[PDB]
Copies of this chain bind each other. A is one copy, B any other.
Amino acid sequence: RVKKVREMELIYARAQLELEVSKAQQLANVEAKKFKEMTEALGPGTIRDLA
């Protein structure tokens, strides 16, 4: 019993692992992309002089 279920919930959280990664990866990608678009959109110095 336990050997069977143990491999079930196992294989599951494994496919559900790369899913989480997929999510947090693409979202961190679109965030860094969106942010790279923000920074660029106003001067590389303009951000420094507003600082």
Contact = CB atoms under 8 A, between A and B. Distances in A.
A50 to B, nearest CB: 4
B17 A19 contact: yes
Interface string A2-27: 11001010101111110111111111
A21 B14 contact: no
Contacts of A33: 28
Given A6-B8, A13-B19, A37 B37 contact: no
Interface of A: 2-3, 6, 8, 10, 12-17, 19-44, 46-51
Given A20-B23, A21-B23, A21-B27, 10 more contacts: A13-B16, A17-B19, A28-B30, A29-B34, A32-B34, A39-B41, A40-B41, A42-B47, A44-B46, A48-B50
